[PDB]
């Protein structure tokens, strides 16, 4: 801010004067601008400043003079070169401008000789020019390359400068400008000769300033030149001798740094001239090397970068020569071998890698000449020290152990014994690296990726059983370390919760995936073992405790919840779907992972038209099998794989051949039953969503197996309409369903099939009107347009049959369902128009911040009113029958779906309805009709898809028989009023068997169980009904027995008989006679499933009598 102001003062004031008024300025426009840290804020401030600054100094001293301007321009150029590296890039046209300015400034310095500002200036300008390696322009490179070559090919300048020459000449030579790279590279010979033949006789001792440049030059241009053979060994080698002294002067180590760096980026022919010096200079080369390695320098890594490189030359020519050229090699590397032993005495530290990498280079090749378990067996033992000791807190950076492991890999690139003892050790080293793979940088992450593909390559080449146990345990470690879950959207979080509820899990798969599809080939048998091994292990994994865990904690933590009063409600809930908690959070923690990635693993790996018949035939059977214990995500891995297998034609064609290797397809058919049943019966709406992705897709694949049978897609799409747009998950899977099957032999059946079809379709179009959401809708539109024929007469009978115009408005709006008396003027209160709206409010779930709270609290209050103005002799009184029932139904269902969003709110709404179900027992009938009648249809809700409303309901009843049994008001009211007791059981048994027995069965059983604790104690009333308890089974048993359409029913009914156990406490003594006669009469009338019950009663009742 002040930077613009100040620079606009002393730049234009600099246009007429100078001196102090420069430096202060430049310190100012420096320091504040300097401290600029984060981008955006600090960046946007600094952009304008720097720009006006560059240009300003440019034309400023460009159009001024000397006296003191030169000093100011000097300073600004200094502060600028330190502004560029900091201010990342984003200064490109500005940059090229600055650079041509810098050469202009040395130019103005040409007239005047001697002095010192020429040096400050000159050097600084140079550094501006140097820190320019963004490039990628065009003429921006030749514009400076040409003219620096121009000013360099002729100038007899002394020394205080010559570093720049070769600095630049290499810098531009590293770009590309073709014929420049040529002319330069040839012209360098001159300078090389000047400085080298200079360093032999003209000066006794080396000179740092021109070595600086010279070696920078020959380092930087030769990567582009190549074919070096002669000049490098002399020049470089010498520089090594020259730093093998040192005294006090700074930059001494960098003199050493520039050549060794040269040599490493020249590892080709140059390193060959060093190969020749593996005898006279076998000590010399690695002694300047290692002696550097020990010096406490900023270029420690110069030591390796030269070392590692010339070791590449060792293994190089070592292998590309003959046998004559072997022993003089073994000399050097055995000195390394001594670096492996004597590090026990003196910790080589950094050099400990060297020798590992040492017992890497030659051991890749000289191994071949002679047996060498010595090496590698020692290395091996060492790597087992350095990893097992990671039971020390040495942050032995897990980038270190794959330097060691890299080296271990080519160390391992050879084997031929198998002496046990190597099996365990190599094995664990594998697993360690396979566990060191999350923690890296991304770069080194690819390094170790490369490691594991290598070391595995060797193990595959070798021993034919081990590698398998490798893959298993190494997969175990990954999937168990998974914890915690990296999936903490609604529907997916819901399935993962329906499973289990509460180093990333995700990360590791990059390594596994990328390993199997890295460098191609050999990835074959590799990736196959990898797959199946991973499987069989997981197969037994969840098979550990998870399998138990569901059916366990669902009856365990529920027991810790279970008390005398809550056990009934819990029985009610065992009918919708389980508690969903799990017991065994270990198998229950890793196995979620196991599927969960296992998609992201199996989707991108071995998927060719050769692997994808064996994939299906095999992988199908044991999976679905292992699902036969019921678990969403367990199923979620089956259709992902099954439909991802690009075999919609061989599988379809085969299946058709079976209807008009087959055993797998016999399973294909087999799952459909248990499958659809699982959706409808047990599957809670969120977990229902889960299973339904997975029951949509298999059909989607066996197209011809989706012949008839509409109960599938109807529940499918029908959820996949306005429920699953919240995440294009359930929705998506459906378009493809229709499209694929829209012409897959579904042509013969349409007028009867497609009304169901548009029938759903309407709530993905005709709601979404009320993979972006709108795009889903568009795909709908396309999907329908392609048809034309019968999109109409379907959604006709659809919309009409669904009515949707159900207009209650209580006895056709006589007057006011609930007046009020507040303003005492223009009351408008009535409410008859104010009901079906509030109904839609409990269904809203939209603006749950505004809607739920005051919409619901409102409906509640409105409820209060209608509750009250129902006492006199107006319309309200004999008005309760429409009024009260028609809302009342939606009152408990309010408390249930309120559970999901109301919380404290729903809490108080619950007892509110409960007081409302006690009331008209502790008062009178007419209003008895209501609750008892609707909720009497709530256990019809359960035999619908409806789920938790049923539990809520049972919790109502259990309290309404409590409010009869509390409402004594003389048992004269007992007989006179006919809402409970006798009247109850009539409604109940008749309820047990109304519809033969189907969507009403799961109602009766709940009732008996929900009332049991009360049936236990209440005098002779405990008597008659116990006999009618015997019809109950006779009821429910046979009821479901014949129409055993899977459990849900079959179970709760037996539980009602486990309420028939209560009778067995010897009483009234006519039980011993009549009640015992019945179980006798039950074998000759053994009704298909009463069997287990019949016999039970026989032994049990002959038992105490």
């Amino acid at each position: 801010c002040s930077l613009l102001r100040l620079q606009e003062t002393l730049s234009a004031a600099d246009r007429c004067g100078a001196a102090l008024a420069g430096h202060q300025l430049i310190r100012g426009l420096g320091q504040e601008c300097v401290l600029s840290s984060s981008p955006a804020v600090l960046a946007l401030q600094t952009s304008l400043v720097f720009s006006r600054d560059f240009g300003l100094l440019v034309f400023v001293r460009k159009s001024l003079n000397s006296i003191e301007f030169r000093e100011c321009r000097e300073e600004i150029l200094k502060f600028l070169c330190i502004f560029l590296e900091k201010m990342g890039q984003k200064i490109a046209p500005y940059s090229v401008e600055i650079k041509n300015t810098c050469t202009s400034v040395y130019t103005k310095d040409r007239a005047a000789k001697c002095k010192i500002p020429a040096l400050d200036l000159l050097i600084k300008l140079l550094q501006t020019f140097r820190s320019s390696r963004l490039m990628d322009e065009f003429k921006i490179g030749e514009l400076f390359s040409k003219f620096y070559g121009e000013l360099a090919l002729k100038k007899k300048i002394p020394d205080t400068v010559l570093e720049k020459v070769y600095e630049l000449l290499g810098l531009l030579g590293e770009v590309h400008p073709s014929e420049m790279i040529n002319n330069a590279e040839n012209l360098f010979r001159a300078f090389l000769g000047e400085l080298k033949t200079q360093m032999t006789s003209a000066v006794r001792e080396p000179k740092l300033p021109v070595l600086a440049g010279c070696l920078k030059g020959l380092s930087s241009l030769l990567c582009n030149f190549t074919k070096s053979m002669e000049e490098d060994p002399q020049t470089s080698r010498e520089i090594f001798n020259f730093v093998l002294k040192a005294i006090r002067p700074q930059i001494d180590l960098k003199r050493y740094a520039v050549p060794s760096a040269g040599l490493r980026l020249f590892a080709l022919h140059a390193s060959q001239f060093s190969t020749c010096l593996l005898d006279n200079y076998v000590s010399l080369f690695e002694v300047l090397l290692k002696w550097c390695a020990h010096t406490n320098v900023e270029l420690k890594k110069a030591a390796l970068s030269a070392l590692e490189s010339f070791l590449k030359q060792v293994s190089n020519m070592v292998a590309k020569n003959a046998e004559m050229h072997k022993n003089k090699l073994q000399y050097f590397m055995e000195q390394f071998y001594g670096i492996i032993r004597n590090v026990d005495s003196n910790n080589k530290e950094l050099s400990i890698a060297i020798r590992g990498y040492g017992l890497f280079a030659g051991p890749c090749k000289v191994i071949n000449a002679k047996d060498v378990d010595f090496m590698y067996v020692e290395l091996i033992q060492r790597c087992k020290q350095m990893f097992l000791t990671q039971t020390d807190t040495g942050d032995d950076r897990v980038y270190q152990m794959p330097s060691f492991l890299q080296s271990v890999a080519s160390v391992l690139l050879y084997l031929d014994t198998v002496p046990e003892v190597y099996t365990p050790v190599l094995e664990h080293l594998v697993v360690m690296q396979i566990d060191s793979f999350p923690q890296y940088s991304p770069k080194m992450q690819l390094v170790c990726c490369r490691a594991i593909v290598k070391v595995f390559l060797a193990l595959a080449a070798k021993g034919p059983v081990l590698r398998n146990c490798i893959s298993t345990v190494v997969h175990q470690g990954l999937i168990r370390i998974c914890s915690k879950p990296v999936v903490l959207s609604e529907s997916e979080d819901h399935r993962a919760s329906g499973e289990v509820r509460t180093k990333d899990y995700v990360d590791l798969f990059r390594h596994l995936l990328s390993s199997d599809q890295m460098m191609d080939s050999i990835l074959a048998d590799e990736a196959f073992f990898s797959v199946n091994s991973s499987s069989e292990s997981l197969n037994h994994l969840l098979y550990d405790e998870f399998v138990k865990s569901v059916l366990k904690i669902v009856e365990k933590l529920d027991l810790t919840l279970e008390i005398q009063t809550v056990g009934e409600q819990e029985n009610g809930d065992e009918a919708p779907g389980v508690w969903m908690i799990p017991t065994s959070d270990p198998a229950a923690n890793l196995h979620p992972a196991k599927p969960k990635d296992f998609s992201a693993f199996i989707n991108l790996v071995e998927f060719c038209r050769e692997i994808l018949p064996e994939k299906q035939a095999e992988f199908f059977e044991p999976w679905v099998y292992s699902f036969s214990y019921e678990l969403i995500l367990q199923s979620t891995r089956l259709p992902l794989i099954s439909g991802f297998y690009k075999l919609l034609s061989i599988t379809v064609r085969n299946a058709k051949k079976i209807k008009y290797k087959y055993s797998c397809f016999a399973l294909f058919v087999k799952f459909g039953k248990e499958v659809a049943v699982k959706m409808k019966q047990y599957k809670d709406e969120l977990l229902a969503s889960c299973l339904t992705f997975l029951l949509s897709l298999p059909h989607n694949i066996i197209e011809l197996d989706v012949r008839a049978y509409v109960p599938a897609l109807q529940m499918a799409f029908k959820l996949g309409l306005s429920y699953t747009p919240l995440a294009e998950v359930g929705l998506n899977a459906l378009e493809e369903w229709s499209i694929y099957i829209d012409r897959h032999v579904m042509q013969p059946y349409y007028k009867d099939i497609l009304p169901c079809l548009d029938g759903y379709l309407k709530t993905s179009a005709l709601s979404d009107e009320t993979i972006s959401l709108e795009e889903i809708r568009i795909r709908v539109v396309q999907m329908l347009g392609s048809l034309g024929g019968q999109i109409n007469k379907n959604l006709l009978t659809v919309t009409s049959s669904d009515e949707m115009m159900k207009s209650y408005v209580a006895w056709d709006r006589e007057k006011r369902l609930s007046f009020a008396v507040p303003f005492r003027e223009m009351k408008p209160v009535i409410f008859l128009d104010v009901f079906l709206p509030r109904v839609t409010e409990l269904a809203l779930t939209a603006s749950d911040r505004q809607t739920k709270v005051a919409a619901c609290e409102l409906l509640h209050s409105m409820v209060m009113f209608m509750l009250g103005k129902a006492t006199q002799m107006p319309e309200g009184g004999q008005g309760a029958p429409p009024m009260y029932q028609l809302y009342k139904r939606t009152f408990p269902v309010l408390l249930r779906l309120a559970c999901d969003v109301d919380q404290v709110t729903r809490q108080l709404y619950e007892p509110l309805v409960m007081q409302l179900i006690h009331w008209f027992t502790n008062n009178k009938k007419f209003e008895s009709q209501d609750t008892v009648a609707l909720l009497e249809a709530i256990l019809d809700g359960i035999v619908d898809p409806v789920d938790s409303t049923l539990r809520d309901f049972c919790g109502r009843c259990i309290r309404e028989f409590l409010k009869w049994s509390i409402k004594q008001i003389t048992p004269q009211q007992q007989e006179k009023s006919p809402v409970n007791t006798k009247s109850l059981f009539k409604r109940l048994y008749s309820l047990a068997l109304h519809p033969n027995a189907f969507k009403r069965l799961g109602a009766s059983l709940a009732f008996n169980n929900i009332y049991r604790e009360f049936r236990e104690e209440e005098s002779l009333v405990e008597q008659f009904v116990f006999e009618a308890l015997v019809i109950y089974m006779e009821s429910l048993a046979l009821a479901h027995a014949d129409e055993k359409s899977l459990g849900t029913i079959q179970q709760c009914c037996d539980a009602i008989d486990h309420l028939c156990r209560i009778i067995e406490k010897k009483h009234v003594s006519l039980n011993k006679a009549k009640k015992r006669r019945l179980p006798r009469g039950f074998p000759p009338s053994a009704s298909l499933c009463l069997l287990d019950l019949v016999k039970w009663l026989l032994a049990h009742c002959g038992r105490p009598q």
Binding site: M826, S847, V853, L858
Partner: protein, 162 residues
């Protein structure tokens, strides 16, 4: 053009109540006439929601409190909310979640005190945030006239919002 804000409830409230207290006539019926003089100008939907909040409020402010048979006072406190602490991010989502909690606390506060006493249910959704780190005799008089004027606004407001 200001009577409906783009978002900030506090501009809208302070504006609305500058329209309401003195400009709107003290008469009930005369306000019923001033209404459609003021509605058509917005040329912009949900006006009638604004209608209701002006009128239900004006006719209900204090014949209704003690002769029954909160969202304007929590409205003014929700105009001193944005005039002080809290700006943006999910912190304002705990202020819209606490706005949910209190908007329920209007006509619920009665019923939840019925359940037990004055302080119960107050935290509501924030009670979970706090947890992680005279009952029958109480229900009976709320259902009578305990504070049925608190039922008036939750009506109006629940209608205003959608």
């Amino acid at each position: 053009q200001g009577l409906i804000d783009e978002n900030p409830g506090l501009q809208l409230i302070i504006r609305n109540f500058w329209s309401h207290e003195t400009r709107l006539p003290s008469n009930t019926l005369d306000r019923l006439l001033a209404l459609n003089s003021l509605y058509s100008p917005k040329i912009e939907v949900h006006f009638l929601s604004l209608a209701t909040n002006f009128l239900l409020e004006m006719t209900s402010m204090s014949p209704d409190y003690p002769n029954p048979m909160x969202x304007x006072x929590x409205x003014x406190x929700x105009x001193x909310x944005x005039x002080x602490x809290x700006x943006x991010x999910x912190x304002x989502x705990x202020x819209x979640x606490x706005x949910x909690x209190x908007x329920x606390x209007x006509x619920x506060x009665x019923x939840x005190x019925x359940x037990x006493x004055x302080x119960x249910x107050x935290x509501x959704x924030x009670x979970x945030x706090x947890x992680x780190x005279s009952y029958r005799h109480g229900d009976l008089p709320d259902i009578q006239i305990k504070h049925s004027s608190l039922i008036t606004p939750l009506q109006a407001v629940a209608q205003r919002d959608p």
